[PDB]
Design a protein around this ligand. Structure first.
Ligand SMILES: CCCCCCCCCCCCCCCCCC(=O)OC[C@H](COP(=O)([O-])OCC(O)COP(=O)([O-])OC[C@@H](COC(=O)CCCCCCCCCCCCCCCCC)OC(=O)CCCCCCCCCCCCCCCCC)OC(=O)CCCCCCCCCCCCCCCCC
Ligand SMILES: COC1=C(OC)C(=O)C(C/C=C(\C)CC/C=C(\C)CC/C=C(\C)CC/C=C(/C)CC/C=C(/C)CC/C=C(\C)CC/C=C(\C)CC/C=C(\C)CC/C=C(/C)CCC=C(C)C)=C(C)C1=O
Ligand SMILES: CCCCCCCCCCCCCCCCCC(=O)OC[C@H](COP(=O)([O-])OCC[N+](C)(C)C)OC(=O)CCCCCCCCCCCCCCCCC
Ligand SMILES: CCCCCCCCCCCCCCCCCC(=O)OC[C@H](COP(=O)([O-])OCC[N+](C)(C)C)OC(=O)CCCCCCCCCCCCCCCCC
Ligand SMILES: CCCCCCCCCCCCCCCCCC(=O)OC[C@H](COP(=O)([O-])OCC[N+](C)(C)C)OC(=O)CCCCCCCCCCCCCCCCC
Ligand SMILES: CCCCCCCCCCCCCCCCCC(=O)OC[C@H](COP(=O)(O)OCCN)OC(=O)CCCCCCCCCCCCCCCCC
Ligand SMILES: CCCCCCCCCCCCCCCCCC(=O)OC[C@H](COP(=O)(O)OCCN)OC(=O)CCCCCCCCCCCCCCCCC
Ligand SMILES: CCCCCCCCCCCCCCCCCC(=O)OC[C@H](COP(=O)(O)OCCN)OC(=O)CCCCCCCCCCCCCCCCC
Ligand code: SF4
Ligand code: SF4
Ligand code: SF4
Lengths: 188, 70, 56, 360, 318, 115, 97, 178, 155
């Protein structure tokens, strides 16, 4: 519809954006309030490359100043693609809480998401949220991105401590980056 | 002036009068026009239990007098 | 200033000092807010003569 | 709870006041001194004004000098009220703070009547005094001062014989006279330790040499003796206020030199030389002849000094401000030996500390 | 009917402490030549309710470096101990009649000290640690003094109950027989309630807020409710023990009224003390108690041991 | 049973109040908000270091005096005894030796907060 | 005696603001019950009473209008709702209304 | 001269009556009871609190409040674009861009006063040769944004037109002193 | 009608938050001297229900009263951040408003709004205690105008 009305509109498609007060890293870190981590197919066959907020905002500002991008579509992705299981394991490693995963089928997980989404306030999670969690990212092949919009994509292993340090206890609050091993990066 | 504190003082006064008066009245209502009949010792507790058995309605405060004896 | 005699006696006895003589609220002894216009004096060197600036 | 070392980091109110002063003219740099020690505004104004007057080789008229002494003792009462009551507030009692701050509000009303502002009254100037008193001001000052000693008596009765206040202040922060001289305290800690020194008696500047008062002298060098010294200085300030009200002379308000003081507005609007001098004083300012002076004034917190260096233009080349609180807070670590957190708070209170003058 | 009795004890006490906050602000203001709140209510009577609603609608703000379990347990513990301490008081008939009422009072007060200590240690901050250690010192001193005072006074009394105190003070107060014990008990109740002069646990000037410096609104309101409830309770216990109200078997309403008047007078005396005096140092409080009150109360405990023996005035067991 | 019910009602009231306090308002939590306070600067230490209290001897003396209190507390039932002379002598001896211990500690500067 | 005279001035203040509705209006708007000499009634509706028996500072006061420039100022009383001439009189720069 | 504040002259020796007096002072807390009586007297005094928005605090005609640009009785603006108020402004809070008007009079086109930069010292109003800029009595002009305190010539002329009934009276009451 | 009930509930919570305003015991300079002159018996903020609390955890509004130095600014930001959520800022005086007399200094933050979001600006140098009380009441009206429950209900 935006293409039809405004034919030269820049369309920016980021991945699941991470950062402070996000709903991705903070969501997976807030999985600690329950018994286990209910992932679909144990978090495998689901590939994500999250992108930093400063990278996305810098891309938007470079798009509104750029001589090109007069109708182009950009794919704002992170530099590394992770499996969902490895990403959640890295998140709980940086949080230093614990990590017990749990295979949960998507049908009953959507039921639980609808149960959580039945809320007059801002819901903690919903069916659409768990569907977007368990939808894999696509490979950005022909679309331009942050690299040719002039933004170096900052890795999650670099800008991850500023998000997940809230969710640690006092015992593990003063831990550096090197205390957590980085997640395995898949290619696919 | 200084008498401006008297509304708050009077509210505190009624809120301190209410609990003791209410406790005494509730004790009277529950014990049938008499006091609580506190039992500091086993003799007083035995008197209360004997009164409860004597009354027949399983209430120690129902006092039985000379009308039970012919 | 508008206090009863009993309250004044209680205040004086409790303070140990006489309070009505030097109470810290101003009632009428202060100056009127509307004042007559002033006529400020001129100082020296308004002499119109023997008043060269090199001598002062 | 015992204090092993004090290290006061300052500079969180440092605003480059000396650099701004050297970037502005003398009349433009005057209201910075209202904000150096913002409890004794007229006192800092008097210090800066006497420094500029000494550089200019002019003297304010006698009425201006008597008004400056009257408002100097008014600032002294304000500052000692503030010091004593906030010291007592840090100790734990707040009713003297409220009572003497009602009195402080009356004196701020006096400032607002003599000038525009209640606090930063840019009133005492190198040309004597900016404006003359309104016609009811002396009578209202008398009405305030005749009732003021009762308030000091109420605070004195509340604190002085109180055994809790005595246990909190006696033998706390004891400074020997030699250590006070070596640390360069110079203001109230000297007379609290017994050193007979007061600039108003030793190096008098205004008509302080012809007013009569006493300098309270301590004998133990502790917080209690300093508190007694401040209360007695309030009483002697009341005495000087009475003398100033009696001996106020009928003269002009500023030095009759239109190349230093601005002329009256009527003369400015009717005269050519007066308009020229008004224009030049309010655009360029008066040229101070080159030279350096150090002018020290017995401010209520201590010896307040201005080292002024003039290069001959209408802007000061250098203006160093010597604050007593700088030396006192430098000496805070020495006074806080073998004490705890609570008496360290007491020592901070007993040092007359404002951080505007310390940081500048 | 017993739950109705619990409500008629608990709800008036909470309204009484809220208006104690109002009365404290107004009395301190009028002793400071100003007013109290007079805008929120008709005469400021809605000010504690506005304060309570604001505190319970601000966020509690759990901190990072904080033992959360103790951080949550401590204020609820303080409030429930204040109400549990309010339970056994007779006016003139208690809700719960205990034989060892004074011992129950002492145990509950010590547990309230534990609530303060656990809050101070759990809120992992230096000022909270300072407040907790000051609470430790304060409760050492007043605990030993209070135990001796109550021992001597209840030796003048019979058992450890409080209806026995009513029957003892039926004819005359206990202030006239033991007024030095009453003075030391008043000072000890100040120390127990952590009130001025020697508050030293929420010291606004030496510390920032003491043990509440990390407690945001909510549990902070719980701590405040517990403190002011303890203020009213210590004054109520003082007037039951020492300033014995008039008791008549036919009507207890005049007993309740006399108890109310004397408790209000002693609460206003607490606010009066706060307006009048500066703060002690917390080592000076320990020195003052252990060097002035403890020898004098040991001697007076010995005197009250000897007194019924040589006067033959030994009180009855019941 | 009555006292048990009142205790549980007070505990449930305090729990209800803190649950209302935690579930009623709006939460916005971030790191600088939940950092420890330390008067507007980052704390140098971890607030779990040794504190080195200065009244440790007074605390141990408080333990001993609290047990002397526990000894002295059955006096209201002790004065009901049939002998009363050995009772009076024993109470005098107990209070006297407690006072002698306090006096000896005061003389030996035990309660003086050695820094 | 003095107490009965205080009570007489109190009942005068209570029954001096018109009726019960006027008493409640001034008591819940201005938070005081006082009787002063009317000297004001400006064009916007502000009242401007005075009483020289009171001390300096409380001897002049204004009861604000309930409506000014379309704004319902029944509860939202404002310090800037005073026109400049009554502003000067109320801040006591002159003794002349 | 000087005096001692804590030194005592000789001693009052030791006497049974003086010892009993000191003992009663220590034991009966006499100075503490005296302080209680003092604050009780303060309780029974009358408070100094004014009812704020209805009873305003007293002021003076010299009071420095909100700035205003005045006019002649003919309605012509008093300001003649002479810039010496911004020359004397110690905070550099005034900007006085100017040009000849359509009738050839020397007037201002931009007269900005930054109230967030101004120190409220009255140097502009005491430097102005035509009494154009004044500091009138308005002090209740607090705003909810920083930008509303960045005044321009239209705002200053509006303030002058608003407060002229009070500013003129204050200048009438004050001008003989200045 | 849910709109009427939500509006009245929002008015109730705004009344509570505006009748119980607890500023922090935090000042910097001469403007804080005027702030405690607003605490003085004349213009009794405690009569208004406004009472200082030392800890930022028990504070509601930061009255930035004084010159915000560069060395001071991290402390002010940390102290503001440590407040609980319904927090307000009253800048007071020319220094906290826009730097004031020290606007061109090398060490002064040109206005505290560069550091913290400011709700109410109070002009003056110093503003009178009456003027600061005016700003406090204007803040009370500003948070009386807030409609959080109604915005939530139409959200
Ligand atoms: C109370 C608030 C509501 C009434 C306010 C009102 O209309 O005030 C007008 C008016 C005061 O206005 P005012 O003329 O400015 O004050 C006169 C003096 O300046 C007042 O100065 P004063 O202190 O000299 O006068 C106080 C006077 C009167 O004080 C009393 O009557 C207070 C109660 C004493 C018991 O005290 C006495 O006569 C001696 C009392 C000794 C007590 C020990 O009259 C009163 O307040 C009369 C006293 C009312 C007492 C009400 C007590 C019950 C309160 C509600 C409980 C539920
Ligand atoms: C020269 O150098 C300088 C200084 O050096 C001297 C400085 O200092 C300095 C800094 C300067 C400043 C920061 C200035 C600030 C001002 C001051 C320091 C002085 C002002 C005075 C004080 C701070 C002392 C105040 C004294 C008082 C006596 C006031 C009383 C205050 C209190 C906190 C105690 C009273 C309590 C309260 C106000 C709140 C009580 C209420 C509650 C907590 C409510 C709780 C109740 C409930 C939860 C009840 C609920 C239960 C129910 C059943 C209710 C039912 C409800 C229903 C809805 C039905 C500067 C910059 C400076 O340059
Ligand atoms: C049989 C039933 C009786 C109870 C035993 C079984 C249940 C408890 C098992 C032990 C749990 C210990 C534990 O987890 O401690 C961690 C916690 C400390 O953990 P923490 O609070 O430091 O960290 C939690 C941090 N978050 C929430 C972010 C994850 O310690 C406690 O819970 C002990 C508190 C006291 C518990 C008892 C209170 C009784 C009433 C006192 C008045
Ligand atoms: C509950 C009923 C009412 C109680 C009183 C309530 C109203 C009065 C309140 C006053 C203000 C209290 C606020 C807190 C004050 C804290 C300071 C304080 O009190 O310190 C204690 C002060 C301490 O004084 P101090 O600390 O200054 O002492 C100096 C000591 N050195 C030098 C070692 C530091 O006083 C006491 O300790 C006295 C306690 C009471 C003594 C009573 C003795 C009565 C007489 C006995 C018998 C005499 C005759 C002998 C035999 C004759 C036989 C024929
Ligand atoms: C004294 C004893 C009792 C103490 C407790 C108080 C009892 C009386 C309470 C009455 C008011 C109840 C609702 C208060 C809500 C306070 C928080 C608030 O307004 O949150 C707004 C928020 C608004 O949510 P939102 O959808 O705007 O999103 C919040 C996140 N932002 C704004 C950043 C996008 O929450 C609510 O509106 C919840 C309303 C719950 C009502 C329950 C009844
Ligand atoms: C936030 C967690 C809080 C946890 C701590 C709770 C503290 C509660 C308050 C302090 C209690 C201190 C100890 C008091 C013990 C009881 C005192 C007493 O004397 O009890 C005896 C009494 C009857 O004895 P007597 O008076 O001789 O009567 C005989 C003839 N009339 O009466 C009796 O025999 C009644 C016996 C039971 C009384 C106590 C009941 C306590 C119930 C458990 C509370 C805690 C539960 C765990 C936590 C729950 C979840 C938070
Ligand atoms: C059997 C014995 C026990 C009976 C019950 C009484 C219990 C008393 C317990 C405490 C007694 C301690 C006495 C010794 C002591 O430690 O005294 C210390 C005290 C000086 O210490 P302090 O006050 O801290 O001084 C600091 C620096 N000046 O020293 C002093 O102040 C000197 C005091 C000298 C006079 C003592 C009292 C004599 C009373 C005689 C009464 C005769 C009738
Ligand atoms: C219940 C839902 C409605 C709650 C009140 C909403 C209307 C409101 O706030 O009215 C304002 C009125 C006066 O408050 P205000 O405007 O601050 O007055 C200034 C006068 N000097 O406010 C009041 O009169 C206070 C109303 C309080 C209502 C009870 C609160 C719980 C107890
Ligand atoms: S009052 Fe002073 S700082 Fe303000 S605009 Fe005028 S000259 Fe400049
Ligand atoms: S306001 Fe006055 S001083 Fe300023 S430019 Fe205009 S005429 Fe000149
Ligand atoms: S604006 Fe003025 S009064 Fe306020 S802090 Fe700055 S210099 Fe001081």
């Amino acid at each position: 519809e935006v293409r039809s009305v405004f034919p030269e509109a820049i369309i920016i498609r980021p991945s699941d954006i991470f950062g402070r007060e996000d709903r991705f890293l903070n969501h997976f870190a807030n999985y600690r309030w329950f018994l286990a981590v209910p992932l679909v197919s144990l978090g495998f066959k689901t590939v994500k490359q999250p992108v930093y907020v400063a990278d996305v905002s810098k891309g938007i500002v470079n798009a509104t100043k750029d001589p090109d991008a007069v109708g182009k579509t950009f794919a704002f992705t992170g530099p590394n693609r992770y499996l969902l299981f490895h990403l959640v394991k890295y998140i709980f490693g940086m949080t230093h809480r614990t990590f017990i995963p749990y295979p949960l089928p998507l049908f009953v997980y959507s039921w639980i998401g609808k149960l959580f989404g039945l809320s007059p306030f801002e819901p903690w999670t919903t069916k659409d949220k768990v569907e977007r969690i368990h939808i894999s990212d696509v490979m950005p092949t022909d679309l331009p991105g942050l690299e040719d919009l002039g933004v170096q994509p900052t890795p999650l292993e670099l800008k991850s401590i500023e998000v997940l340090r809230r969710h640690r206890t006092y015992r593990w609050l003063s831990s550096e980056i090197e205390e957590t091993k980085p997640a395995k990066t898949v290619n696919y | 002036m200084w008498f401006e504190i008297l509304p708050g003082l009077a509210i505190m006064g009624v809120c301190l009068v209410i609990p003791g008066v209410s406790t005494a009245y509730i004790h009277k209502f529950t014990n049938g026009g008499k006091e609580k009949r506190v039992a500091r010792v086993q003799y007083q507790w035995y008197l209360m239990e004997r009164d409860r058995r004597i009354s027949g309605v399983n209430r120690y405060y129902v006092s039985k007098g000379l009308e039970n004896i012919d | 200033a508008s206090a009863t005699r009993v309250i004044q006696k209680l205040r004086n006895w409790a303070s140990g000092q006489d309070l009505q003589a030097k109470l810290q609220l101003r009632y009428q002894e202060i100056a009127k807010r509307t004042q007559p216009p002033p006529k400020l004096p001129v100082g020296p060197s308004h002499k119109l003569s023997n008043n060269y600036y090199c001598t002062r | 709870e015992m204090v092993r070392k004090c290290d006061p980091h300052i500079g969180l109110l440092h605003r480059g006041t000396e650099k701004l002063i050297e970037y502005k003219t003398y009349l433009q740099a005057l209201p910075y001194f209202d904000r150096l020690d913002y409890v004794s505004m007229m006192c800092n104004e008097q210090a800066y004004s006497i420094a500029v007057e000494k550089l200019l080789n002019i003297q304010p008229p006698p009425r201006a000098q008597w008004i400056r002494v009257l408002f100097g003792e008014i600032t002294r009462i304000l500052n000692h009220i503030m010091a004593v009551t906030t010291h007592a507030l840090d100790i734990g009692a707040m009713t003297p703070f409220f009572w003497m701050f009602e009195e402080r509000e009356k004196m701020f009303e006096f400032y607002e009547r003599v000038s525009g502002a209640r606090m930063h009254a840019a009133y005492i100037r190198p040309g004597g005094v900016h404006q003359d008193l309104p016609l009811g001001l002396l009578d209202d000052i008398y009405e305030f001062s005749k009732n003021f000693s009762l308030r000091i008596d109420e605070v004195e009765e509340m604190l002085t014989n109180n055994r809790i206040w005595r246990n909190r202040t006696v033998d706390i922060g004891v400074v020997t006279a030699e250590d006070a001289l070596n640390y360069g305290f110079s203001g109230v800690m000297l007379r609290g330790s017994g050193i007979q020194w007061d600039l108003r008696k030793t190096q008098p500047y205004d008509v302080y040499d012809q007013v009569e008062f006493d300098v309270p002298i301590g004998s133990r060098g502790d917080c209690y003796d300093r508190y007694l010294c401040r209360v007695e200085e309030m009483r002697q300030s009341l005495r000087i206020i009475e003398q100033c009200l009696n001996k106020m002379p009928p003269g002009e308000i500023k030095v009759d030199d239109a190349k230093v003081s601005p002329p009256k507005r009527a003369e400015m609007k009717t005269s050519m030389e007066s308009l020229i001098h008004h224009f030049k004083l309010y655009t360029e300012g008066y040229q101070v002849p080159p030279g350096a002076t150090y002018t020290a004034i017995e401010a209520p917190k201590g010896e307040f000094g201005v080292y002024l260096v003039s290069d001959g233009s209408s802007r000061p080349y250098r203006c160093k401000i010597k604050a007593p609180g700088f030396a006192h807070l430098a000496g805070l670590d020495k006074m806080s030996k073998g004490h705890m957190l609570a008496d360290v708070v007491a020592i901070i209170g007993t040092q007359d500390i404002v951080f505007g003058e310390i940081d500048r | 009917m017993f739950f109705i009795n619990i409500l008629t004890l608990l709800v008036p006490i909470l309204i009484a402490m809220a208006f104690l906050t109002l009365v404290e602000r107004k009395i301190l203001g009028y002793m400071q030549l100003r007013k109290g709140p007079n805008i929120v209510g008709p005469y400021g009577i809605l000010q504690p309710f506005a304060d309570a609603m604001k505190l319970f609608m601000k966020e509690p703000m759990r901190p990072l470096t904080t033992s959360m379990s103790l951080f949550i347990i401590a204020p609820t513990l303080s409030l429930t101990l204040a109400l549990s301490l309010w339970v056994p008081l007779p006016m003139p008939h208690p809700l719960i009649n205990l034989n060892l009422g004074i011992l129950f009072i002492l145990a509950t007060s010590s547990l309230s000290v534990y609530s303060i200590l656990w809050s101070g240690w759990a809120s992992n901050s230096k000022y909270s640690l300072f407040g907790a250690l000051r609470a430790v010192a304060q409760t050492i001193s007043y605990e030993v003094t209070m135990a001796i005072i109550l021992l001597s006074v209840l030796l003048m009394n019979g058992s450890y109950s409080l209806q026995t105190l009513i029957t003892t003070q039926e004819h005359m107060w206990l202030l006239l027989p033991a007024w030095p014990m009453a003075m030391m008990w008043f000072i000890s109740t100040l120390a127990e309630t952590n009130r001025a002069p020697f508050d030293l646990t929420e010291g606004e000037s030496e510390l920032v807020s003491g043990f509440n410096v990390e407690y945001a609104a909510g549990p902070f309101a719980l701590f405040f409710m517990a403190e002011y409830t303890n203020i009213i309770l210590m004054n109520a216990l003082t007037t039951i023990i020492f300033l014995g109200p008039l008791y008549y078997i036919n009507l207890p309403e005049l007993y309740s009224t006399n108890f109310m008047m004397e408790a209000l007078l002693l609460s206003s005396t607490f606010l009066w003390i706060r307006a009048s005096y500066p703060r002690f140092r917390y080592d000076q409080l320990m020195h003052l108690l252990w060097k002035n009150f403890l020898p004098l109360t040991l001697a007076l405990c010995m005197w009250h041991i000897s007194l019924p023996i040589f006067t033959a005035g030994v009180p009855p067991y019941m | 049973m009555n006292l048990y019910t009142v205790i549980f009602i007070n505990i449930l009231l305090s729990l209800t109040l803190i649950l209302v306090a935690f579930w009623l308002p709006q939460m916005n939590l971030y790191s600088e908000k939940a950092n420890p306070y330390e008067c507007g600067f980052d704390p140098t230490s971890s607030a779990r270091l040794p504190f080195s209290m200065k009244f440790f001897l007074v605390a141990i003396t408080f333990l001993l005096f609290d047990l002397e209190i526990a000894l002295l507390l059955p006096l209201p039932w002790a004065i009901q005894t049939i002998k009363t002379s050995t009772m009076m002598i024993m109470a005098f001896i107990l209070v006297t030796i407690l006072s002698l211990g306090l006096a000896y500690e005061w003389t030996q500067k035990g309660l003086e907060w050695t820094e | 005696m003095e107490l009965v005279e205080v009570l007489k001035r109190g009942v005068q203040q209570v029954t001096g603001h018109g009726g019960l509705r006027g008493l409640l209006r001034v008591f819940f708007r201005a938070n005081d019950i006082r009787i002063g000499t009317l000297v004001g009634e400006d064009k916007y509706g502000n009242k401007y009473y005075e009483d020289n028996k009171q001390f300096f500072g409380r001897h002049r006061w204004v009861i604000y209008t309930t409506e000014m420039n379309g704004k319902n100022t029944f509860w939202d009383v404002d310090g800037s709702m005073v026109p400049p001439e009554w502003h000067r009189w109320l801040h006591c720069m002159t003794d002349d209304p | 001269t000087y005096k001692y504040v804590n030194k005592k002259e000789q001693e009052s020796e030791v006497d049974m009556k003086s010892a009993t007096d000191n003992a009663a002072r220590i034991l009966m807390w006499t100075e503490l009871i005296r302080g209680l009586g003092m604050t009780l007297s303060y309780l029974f005094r009358e408070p100094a609190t004014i009812n704020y928005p209805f009873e305003k605090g007293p002021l003076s005609p010299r009071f420095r409040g909100e700035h205003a640009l005045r006019r002649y009785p003919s309605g012509e603006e008093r300001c003649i674009a002479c810039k010496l108020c911004e020359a004397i402004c110690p905070a550099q809070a005034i900007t006085i861009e100017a040009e000849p008007r359509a009738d050839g009079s020397r007037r201002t086109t931009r007269y900005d006063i930054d109230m967030t930069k101004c120190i409220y010292c009255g140097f502009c109003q005491e430097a102005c040769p035509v009494d154009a800029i004044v500091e009138g009595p308005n002090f209740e002009f607090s705003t909810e944004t920083h930008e509303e305190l960045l005044y321009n010539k239209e705002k200053l002329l509006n303030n002058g037109d608003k407060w002229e009934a009070e500013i003129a009276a204050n200048i009438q009451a004050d001008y003989l002193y200045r | 009608r849910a709109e009427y009930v939500v509006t009245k509930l929002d008015d109730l919570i705004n009344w509570a938050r505006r009748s119980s305003l607890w500023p922090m015991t935090f000042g910097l300079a001469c403007c804080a001297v005027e702030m405690m002159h607003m605490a003085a018996p004349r213009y009794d903020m405690d009569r208004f229900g406004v009472v200082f609390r030392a800890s930022p955890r028990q504070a509601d509004v930061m009255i930035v009263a004084g010159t915000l130095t560069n060395k001071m600014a991290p402390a002010l930001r940390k102290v503001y951040d440590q407040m609980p959520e319904p927090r307000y800022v009253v800048s007071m005086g020319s220094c906290a408003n826009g730097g004031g007399y020290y606007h061109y200094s090398y060490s002064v933050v040109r206005g505290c709004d560069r550091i913290v979001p400011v709700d109410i600006y109070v002009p003056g140098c110093p503003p009178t205690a009456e003027a600061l009380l005016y700003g406090i009441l204007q803040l009370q009206r500003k948070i009386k105008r807030e409609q959080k429950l109604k915005i939530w209900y139409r959200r």
